[PDB]
Every structure is written in structure tokens, then in C-alpha cells.
């Protein structure tokens, strides 16, 4: 090694520094919070009725165990796009809460359901924040939503004196004023009803056909994760150089006991270089330090 480091077959007397070494890790451990029930996620997809964009519908999911792989075996979705997380690795993660939003839209307006878009939908009906992580799903429902008699129940806010806030909900239906003299609860040229019906007809060109859309938001906080993928827990080992994954966070190191007086609302601590130093295990209240494995020249 010395010879090949100097590009020469002969070396003079001396001390040569040519390489470094690291202790390799010897075991891998997995330690996930144990949830004792399946997840009724199908409720949000198997439902007959559906919401209207003026009053979109939300569901909050917690305490669940769910496998997303089926969503990639299924081919019933006209559109499937996720942002901020790789869709294949969702089985290896955990979250504090999951939120589902649901509504029917004009297919032409699918362009509007993205962070930072603009238009009547993105400003008067369902404004989405510019910073986002989640996934968005659509499928065409023209067969069921529309009928030979037409369907006109679905309404969208046509006019609005302002633009909504992100995830804002507003059932107020004050008569919109487009005239010099304001009129309240009156039908006239000055003011008219602020919502317009979607006229869904069964022969409409595809762009006008109704598409059902659902948006899934993953939310994670120092509040301990309650929903996790179907991964399995494993025994715990200490004072040896080991690979670990706690609650979605991977790494390698030497786990040890610690005397850090974490408060009940806290989970982990960070060093100046912004790396994890100590953690609270999801199955016991003990606090563990992580120390890197030995290395040197």
C-alpha cells in the first residue's frame, strides 16, 4: 500500500500516512410504536356521496396501520401525483396525523390544484399553501355523478370580495355586490347569488365531465407519531456499533443510557451542527444518547 501510494517500487526510511479506518456496524434494529388496529381508509374512497367545492369535506386519521402498496397495484385513478415524499417509501415512515380532503371538480380545473396556482378555484374555493407535502388523487366519475336528467346540486363560489386563506373554510353566503348601490338579500342587477351550479350533462366533452379529487396531507410534529407503516419492531441492543431506525429516522452509532432530563413534551435533542444527540424510545420512557463509532488514521 505504501509502495502504490508513492507510485514507486522503492521507498526511503520514514513515516507515511496513507489511509484511515472505521469500525463497521454489526447489527441493524427497528423500533416502531405499536398500534393495535387496522385503518378504515376505504371509508373515504368507498363512499357513495361526495362533497362540493364550496364546502369541501375533511377527515382526520390517527391511530392507524396502513399499507399504501395497493394504491400502486390499483389502476382505477385517472391521476396520482405526490409532492415532497417519494411514493414508494411511504411504507417505511410514520406521521403524527393524516388529513383527507375531498371534493368534485370540473376536470379542466385539475391544473389549478397545485401549490401556487391562480384562478377562481385557487382563490375563491380551495386555496392550497405554497409549502406543501402530500399527495393528490383524481378519478373521472362522469358515469355516476352525471345523470340523464343532468345534475345541478354541485355549486362553486363564482364571485368573492376577497381571496381565501390556506385551508380556510367559509360558509358565509352574503349576496355579492357588483353595483354602485349595495343590496342585501335582494335579487337585482346590483347584486346576485354568489354561487353558480355546475351543469353536468352525460354527453359533455370530457374536459367538462366531473372528476372526483382527494388530497392527502401528512402532518408530523414533536407530538409522538400515531400512524405508521406495517413495519415490524425488533429487539434493542446497547453499547455496540449498530444500525438503527427510530420512528422513521435512520442512522448508525452506539446507543447508551443518559441522564438528560427531557420534559414530557420533548422527544429529542440537537447539537450545534444540527444533528440528533439523544432520543426517547417509542416503547419505553428511557432517554438514550447516540455516539458515533470509532475511527482514525
Amino acid at each position, epitope marked *: 500500500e505504501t509502495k502504490c501510494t508513492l507510485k514507486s517500487f522503492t521507498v526511503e526510511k520514514g513515516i507515511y500516512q496513507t489511509s484511515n479506518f472505521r469500525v463497521q456496524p454489526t447489527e441493524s434494529i427497528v423500533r416502531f410504536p405499536n398500534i393495535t388496529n387496522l385503518c378504515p381508509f376505504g*371509508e373515504v374512497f*368507498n363512499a357513495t356521496r361526495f362533497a362540493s367545492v364550496y364546502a369541501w369535506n375533511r377527515k382526520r386519521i390517527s391511530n392507524c396501520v396502513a399499507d399504501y402498496s395497493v394504491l400502486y*397495484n390499483s389502476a382505477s385513478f385517472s391521476t396520482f401525483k405526490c409532492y415532497g415524499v417519494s411514493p414508494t417509501k411511504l411504507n417505511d415512515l410514520c406521521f403524527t396525523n393524516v388529513y383527507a380532503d375531498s371534493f368534485v371538480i370540473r376536470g379542466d380545473e385539475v391544473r389549478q390544484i397545485a401549490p401556487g396556482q391562480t384562478g377562481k378555484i385557487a382563490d375563491y374555493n380551495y386555496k392550497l399553501p405554497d409549502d406543501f407535502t402530500g399527495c393528490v388523487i383524481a378519478w373521472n366519475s362522469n358515469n355516476l355523478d352525471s345523470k340523464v336528467g343532468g345534475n345541478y346540486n354541485y355549486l362553486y363560489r363564482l364571485f368573492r370580495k376577497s381571496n381565501l386563506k390556506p385551508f380556510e373554510r367559509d360558509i358565509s353566503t352574503e349576496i355579492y355586490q357588483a353595483g354602485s348601490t349595495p343590496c342585501n338579500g335582494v335579487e337585482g342587477f346590483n347584486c346576485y347569488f354568489p354561487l353558480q351550479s355546475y351543469g353536468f350533462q352525460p354527453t359533455n366533452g370530457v374536459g367538462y365531465q366531473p372528476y372526483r379529487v382527494v388530497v392527502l396531507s401528512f402532518e408530523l410534529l414533536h407530538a409522538p407519531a400515531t400512524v405508521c407503516g406495517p413495519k415490524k419492531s425488533t429487539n434493542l441492543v446497547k453499547n455496540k456499533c449498530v444500525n438503527f431506525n427510530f420512528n422513521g429516522l435512520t442512522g448508525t452509532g452506539v446507543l447508551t443510557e443518559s441522564n438528560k432530563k427531557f420534559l414530557p413534551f420533548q422527544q429529542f435533542g440537537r447539537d450545534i451542527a444540527d444533528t440528533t444527540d439523544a432520543v426517547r424510545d417509542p416503547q419505553t420512557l428511557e432517554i438514550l444518547d447516540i455516539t458515533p463509532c470509532s475511527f482514525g488514521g
Partner: antibody
Amino acid sequence: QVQLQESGPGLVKPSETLSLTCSVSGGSISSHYWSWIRQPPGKGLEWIGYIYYSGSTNHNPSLKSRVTISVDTSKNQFSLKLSSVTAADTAVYYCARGVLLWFGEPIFEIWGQGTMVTVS
Amino acid sequence: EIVMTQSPATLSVSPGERATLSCRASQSVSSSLAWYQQKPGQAPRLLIYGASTRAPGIPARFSGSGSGTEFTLTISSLQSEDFAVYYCQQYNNWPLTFGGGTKVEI
């Protein structure tokens, strides 16, 4: 956690109605479905119906006119009634909670203790 | 409508050996089965709720796989406490069905 407890008669006469009742403890009928199931002695299981928080319900395709189910919000109780019963209807009856994963039919995960019914 | 059959009706087994079982549906089905254990006089337990996946609380002694025609389940290192009836089930379509079941001896 939740508990399922159930009650009904031990003996019934031919050609008269039969009724059973199952009550939930530790939770409420908010989302998860419920379903009645029967197990004839030494035979395969059979599903007879399911109902959820909305009151909408579906029963076994056969014996369309034989079975009805009513759900009460008060006291977290639901009951089943059969128009009449026969010597073949002797079985253990179970009430069980049902979770809908994604599509199809809901999988039964929590099961009641079961109660025996016989006709003579 | 979907009908389903389970064979054989009984397997003779003695402690310290693996066992294998298979259940078939009249028509193609995938990722839409369950395996239920039935110990004497007990309520059923849900052990397997899909293709090759274990419900939370079930040791890795139980496992299974399958194809559209037939599905199989293996119990490695069978023990005396594994004496039970096993019932395959499907839920892909409205006509729910249970399999015939199999007794596994001591």
C-alpha cells in the same frame, strides 16, 4: 379498547320470531361497521348481515325475508330479528366489528363471545 | 357467484415439523383473502389479512403466499398449542364466503 357483549334467549319455539341484542362498551358507533354472523355446529361460518353508523345495511343474499337489523344510538346497542326459525337454525351467533381497508367488503377483527341458539 | 374450497379436511401432524395448507377460489382473486384461526370454543382470531402480511400480534411462525388459482399457508415449527381449525376467507366481491376449514391435529 372496546368490548362486545350479547344477549338473547336460549330456547325458542318453531314458527315464531327470534331476537338477539349486542352492545358495545368503551366506544361509540361513529365509523366502524357491525355485523351478525352464525356458526352452525361443526360447520362453516356464514355471514348474515352488516350495518354501520348511518343505518344503511346489507344482508346475506339468501333468506331475503328472514332477517332484519335495527341499530340504536342510545346505549350503543344493535339488535337482530328473524321472522321465524327452524331446527336448522340452531347455531352460535356472534356480533363482530368490521373495518373497511380500501375496497370490497370489511374485514372482521373484533368478535363477541357468541351465544347459542336452538329450536325445539 | 364466488365459491371457495379448502383441502385437505384434516392433516395429521406431530410437534417439531412444518405444515402446509392450501385454499382455492372458483375465480381469480388477489390480495383479498384472510386466514382465521379457531381454537376450541374460542372466538376466531385474525392472523393473516392479505398477501404475505401478518396482523399485529402474530408471531412469525405463520406465513403464506399464493397465486390466482390457489393460495398456500405455512406454519413452521408447529406446536401443541397450534391445534385449531383454519378458515380461509375472501372479500373481493359482495358474495362473501368462508372456506370449508381444516383441522390441524396435535
